[PDB]
């Protein structure tokens, strides 16, 4: 049975720490994902996990409707011969990893203009 959408998701294949070469690369990913969410339903928490062999980025959106829109917008991308994939994460699991995300409400904006 396919998991229900939630506010929270994990992207994969967004980067490869073995090969990332640009100074500031993970901030650029953060800004890019926020920009994409800000053509949909926005975003209230994001973490680009530099350590992740799988290239994981964690996102929480302000509602399930917003998460669906972001997932459907992001899970179409390709990088370095792999598709970006998304998996919804249960709220309690996401909140255990990112306690700061539990009470988040402010929609995020990119740093770059």
UniProtKB/Swiss-Prot annotation:
It comes from the Eukaryota. Residues 28-91 form the RRM domain. Residues 1-113 are annotated as: Interaction with NCOA6. It is found in: Nucleus. Interacts with NCOA6 and JUN. Interacts with ESR1 and ESR2, in the presence of estradiol (E2). Interacts with RSRC1 (via Arg/Ser-rich domain). Interacts with SF3B1. Interacts with ZNF106 (via N-terminus). RNA-binding protein that acts as a pre-mRNA splicing factor. Acts by promoting exon inclusion via regulation of exon cassette splicing. Also acts as a transcriptional coactivator for steroid nuclear receptors ESR1/ER-alpha and ESR2/ER-beta, and JUN/AP-1, independently of the pre-mRNA splicing factor activity. Belongs to the splicing factor SR family. This is RNA-binding protein 39. It comes from Mus musculus. The gene is Rbm39. The chain holds residues 418 to 530 of 530 of the full protein.
């Amino acid at each position: 049975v396919q998991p229900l959408a939630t506010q929270c998701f994990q992207l994969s294949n967004m980067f490869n720490p073995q090969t990332e070469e640009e100074v500031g690369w993970d901030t650029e990913i953060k800004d890019d994902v926020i920009e994409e969410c800000n053509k949909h339903g926005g975003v209230i928490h994001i973490y680009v996990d530099k350590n992740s062999a799988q290239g994981n980025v964690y996102v929480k959106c302000p509602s399930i409707a917003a998460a669906i829109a972001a997932v459907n917008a992001l899970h179409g991308r390709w990088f370095a011969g792999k598709m970006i994939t998304a998996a919804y994460v249960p709220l309690p699991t996401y909140h255990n990893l990112f306690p700061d995300s539990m009470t988040a409400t402010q929609l995020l904006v990119p740093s770059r203009r």
